[PDB]
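Bench log. Compound arrived from synthesis this morning; before running ITC I wanted a structural hypothesis for how chloride ion sits in the protein. Inputs:
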Amino acid sequence: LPQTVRIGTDTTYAPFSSKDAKGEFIGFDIDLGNEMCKRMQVKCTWVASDFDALIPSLKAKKIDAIISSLSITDKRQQEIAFSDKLYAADSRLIAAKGSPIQPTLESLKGKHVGVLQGSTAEAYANDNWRTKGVDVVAYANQDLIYSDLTAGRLDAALQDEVAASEGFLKQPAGKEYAFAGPSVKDKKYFGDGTGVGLRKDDTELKAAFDKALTELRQDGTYDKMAKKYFDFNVYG
Ligand SMILES: NC(=[NH2+])NCCC[C@H](N)C(=O)O
Ligand SMILES: [Cl-]
Ligand SMILES: [Cl-]
Ligand SMILES: [Cl-]
């Protein structure tokens, strides 16, 4: 294991990863990463990046791990490895309160829909909606999506359900917004939970993260840290 593990994250996805008023990284991903590093007896350096630059940075050895609500998908397992599941993640649309929008091609006719570049939401929306004439706009970060949604430039946005609820719907900017239909189920695109992204050959590092994650779940640390942000079973 390296003496210092470099962990990449995109800090625009509260409650998982974001910045506080002093610029410190905060959220459930940060708490999990720091606790796992403590148990692994390694020092940790957090590195902020746009989400779509995380896998390229990991492959180029600029970072050693990704903790950034990274969904475990078949496509990504062909290029990188993952730790065991950190928590569940499903994608769901948001739109103005009272909107008739549903996550269907018919409902989205003539709508402007924002997605994060590099995300499972972008991959799903581009293949199923953009090809079929929905104006799917990809963004460098999720904060730009929420801002364009509030400016009226977007009609809807697709992202992880827990991030939209806690990071936007339950925040001042999101009071005028709500979920638009149910979460989207699609095995191929959305994967099964999130994990620490790692290079495929870093077998010792994966085993260390997996061991620390099991240990923090066994002793109840996982649930106690989760309580700060969630009143439900985020693990799934
Ligand atoms: N920190 C972030 N911006 N995370 C975005 C994650 C979205 C989705 N779970 C994915 O893996 O594509
Ligand atoms: Cl910090
Ligand atoms: Cl240490
Ligand atoms: Cl288990």
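What the model suggests: The two ends are 30 Å apart (CA to CA). The chain has two domains: 1-89+191-236, 90-190.
ITC booked for Thursday regardless.
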